[PDB]
């Protein structure tokens, strides 16, 4: 029974190692998405300026 | 005569064991059941990793 508790503890440590790494892959992705948000939002704001300006000039 | 002597000696050695072993069989088998859930959580985490 003491042998089984040592084996069972090794599985739980592998669960934390995978959990720590999958959070890290998500954490790197979250910073990229926020930066891709502002680049798309600035692109949309510049586009809405150009559509309004071209009608105003004509 | 042997089935009288040995099996009554067997039932005494079993029930004296089963008062002690079936408590620690449940300590063994329920900890075996923790392994089959720690393995199933390991595969879906390694798949998501």
Side-chain half-sphere exposure of A34, counting CA atoms within 13 A: 6
Single out the residue of B45, B42, B22 nearest to residue B34, CA to CA: B42
Experimental method: cryo-EM
- The answer to whether the CB atoms of B28 and A11 lie below 8 A apart is no
Task: Tell me, in Å, the resolution of the deposited structure.
Answer: 3.2
CB contact under 8 A, B34 and A14: no
In whole angstroms, what is the distance from residue B24 CA to residue B7 CA?
A: 24
Closest partner CB to A1 (pick from B27, B45, B49): B27
DSSP A1: -
Instruction: Give the residue carrying structure tokens 């990229």.
Output: A32
DSSP 8-state assignment for residue A25: H
> Is the Cβ–Cβ distance between A1 and B28 less than 8 Å?
yes
Half-sphere exposure of A45 (CA within 13 A, CB side): 6
Task: List CB contacts of B39: < 8 A, sequence separation 6 or more.
Answer: A11
A8: CB partners within 8 A, 6+ apart = B31, B34, B35, B38
Are B41 and A21 in contact (CB < 8 Å)? no
Q: Helix, strand or coil for residue A58?
A: coil
According to DSSP, residue B1 is labeled: -
How is residue A32 written in tokens? 């990229």
- Rounded to the nearest 5 degrees, what angle is found at the Cα of A22, between the Cα atoms of A19 and A24? 110
Contacts of B19 (CB under 8 A, 6+ apart): none
């Amino acid at each position: 029974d003491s042998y089984l508790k040592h084996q069972e503890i090794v599985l739980d440590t592998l669960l934390p190692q995978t959990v720590s790494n999958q959070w890290r892959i998500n954490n790197d992705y979250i910073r990229q998405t926020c930066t891709i948000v502002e680049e798309m939002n600035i692109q949309q704001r510049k586009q809405i300026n150009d559509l309004e300006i071209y009608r105003k000039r004509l | 005569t042997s089935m009288k002597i040995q099996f009554k000696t067997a039932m005494p050695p079993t029930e004296v064991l089963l008062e002690s072993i079936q408590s620690k069989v449940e300590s063994i088998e329920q900890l075996q059941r923790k392994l089959q859930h720690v393995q199933p959580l390991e595969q879906q985490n390694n798949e998501m990793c």
